[PDB]
Symmetry: C3
Subunit: 281 residues, 3 copies
Amino acid sequence: LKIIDFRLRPPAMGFLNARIYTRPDIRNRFTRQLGFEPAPSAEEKSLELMFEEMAAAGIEQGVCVGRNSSVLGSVSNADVAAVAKAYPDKFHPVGSIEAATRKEAMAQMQEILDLGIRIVNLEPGVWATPMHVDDRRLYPLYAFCEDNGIPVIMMTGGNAGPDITYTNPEHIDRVLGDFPDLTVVSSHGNWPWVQEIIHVAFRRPNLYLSPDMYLYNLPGHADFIQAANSFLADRMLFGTAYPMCPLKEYTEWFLTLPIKPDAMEKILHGNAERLLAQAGR
Amino acid sequence: LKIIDFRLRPPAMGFLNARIYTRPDIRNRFTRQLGFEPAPSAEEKSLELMFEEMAAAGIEQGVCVGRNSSVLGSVSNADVAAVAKAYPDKFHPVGSIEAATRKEAMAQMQEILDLGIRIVNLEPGVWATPMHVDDRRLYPLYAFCEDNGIPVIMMTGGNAGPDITYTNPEHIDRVLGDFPDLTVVSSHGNWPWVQEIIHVAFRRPNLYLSPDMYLYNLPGHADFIQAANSFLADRMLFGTAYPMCPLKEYTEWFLTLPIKPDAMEKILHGNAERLLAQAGR
Amino acid sequence: LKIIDFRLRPPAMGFLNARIYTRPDIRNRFTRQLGFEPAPSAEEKSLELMFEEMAAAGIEQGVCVGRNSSVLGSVSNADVAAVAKAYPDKFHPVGSIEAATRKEAMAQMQEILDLGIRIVNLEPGVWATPMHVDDRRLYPLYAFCEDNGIPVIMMTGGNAGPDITYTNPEHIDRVLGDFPDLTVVSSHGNWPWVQEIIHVAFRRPNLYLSPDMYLYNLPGHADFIQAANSFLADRMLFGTAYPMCPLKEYTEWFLTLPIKPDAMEKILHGNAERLLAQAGR
Ligand code: NA
């Protein structure tokens, strides 16, 4: 079985400057609170060990999700492009933006497009100026992304902002309503508001869900899996959130889940493949 | 066993001018997403075939829920009365209002009463002037309805408005709080906010839930069925949302759910009968 | 197995003036709707029968949560401290505040501390002027409590206020964010917003959950138990909400729950012992 991990941040270049690597202590406590042991590759910050674990898990490719955050640390978009070009068979680059203004957002989007990157990651709740995903100042960017076929990853689950209002499903739903042709991926799957996000997915055909780490032994698990076996088969994206979860143990667990095999193939690989090929029109 | 469908919109007269029939592409998309195949009678727009499917499903009566909506299309209240008087042993009429002002809401309620209809349907999130169910402008109407024993159906689940805020349980909860003797039916059962709406129903004894289409293989399913076997036995209403769901397959699926027979009788007909007899006091 | 009941209001001087005892009719209607029969000790208002019922269920100690409320009645803090001193082996006193002005709140907090009580209960949604738990006017009190190691019980589940907004998880989450060293216990466990509150508890290590009566055959049950068997073993507190639930039947049922033995020990008594010993640093 082929697997594309929709959230894999390798221990390479600028990724090591993000808090996921600069604060191994915080990360490891989070990993253990979830129910996993830290991945040896993550703890040793070894790309070599990561590649072994990746192959042993059955993961053929990883989506290298960029990050630019005052709160959570930063990897340069140039470094994300550099990691992907170094291993072009193994990695897909996703650029990120941290902006106070709409002009800063477009300058950075253009920087991303100049690197050949065609997907962007927005985590505005952990920016220097924290904002909701439906903040007015982000609307010109969504307009650009919608017009140019750029899919948008947005962190609308987990600790997406200062408090739980930053995950209320009203924020992602407004964006989807206002930009009906914009391809959106919700990283952390808008957890914990899971009954609600399944409705949003039901209503808004261009939303993909990626609960990633929060799929594991938490509220909403059964809701995600039920939807996976129905309409969400084409719109769920497998992801480990590595280094937050181990590649091996998360994937092995995932493959045992009662998701019907045709939906399993879509969720593990098929959907990501379609989205990644679609990116940039 | 007697079955009263609390949400059946027949392919007859002005019902055929509503988006549920004028846009079968939108309807069939939701139907297939739910996991059903479109009903032959819906696709054919045949009242004859609907009567066949209705009889085969074991459904003796349907509640013809009128609709007046800029977004979703409209059926005159006179058309609704006409359908019911044409088949008085098959159909119960429910009037609908679309208003910008409280006086327009009154004038339409009076028009409904003049037709001998004694239950009203409000879907204010899909009006030309969209509003929440707890909008100040609707309060005079709720006052009149409470004082005159008129049950109100209100769409507070599913795609009730422009975005998910139109299903936030705060809106229905305030209405129930401010009008504690007003009989209220939440059509689509305030889905997706199911953990929340069970609390609301627990607290507000005048609230009836009708999850209808959204009971099918979606989040909250087990919460609704748990409540149905306990305190909500007297306050849940069977409904298909036909033409959104086929009569046969929905009803056959409903009939095998784990609901004790005395709650099952109430939910299939007993609760609807009491409400229909109550209506107009 | 030793048990500490984190919500047990005895039929003793003062507590008898609250609506839990002055309206046995409303109370018994709730108890039966939940699915229990009223405790004989509650019905007969006998401290004598209560101790028998406690000992039979294995409840060694009860937390006599004081109440000061316009909506739900009041019991003076002196009366709470006097129940505890009459039975020092059986009862832990918890003070309560109802205040309009913060100088009223601070005089009441001082009174509590003078009475030897080291835990305060806040139910601001049921005060004469209802307010949310994150109301700016409560921040001085939280700051005092945080600096002086006073744990705060706050009712943020159930009928915590006039409507469901008074249990929206944004309110408790803000308090927890702005007072990260404050020990907070959510009485009624912030039910019905269970998927959400498990995230809040996951994020906010100072939060303890006591779902009490709402654990029983209601939405969120499986979420609470799953949390109890994972990260929340150290932060869940057994309680019956007596007289709302019978000591005998609630406790017997709770003991049959699939909670791993070391978590069962912590939740039944260990967590409370720790909290009660910590109280007042
Ligand atoms: Na919820």
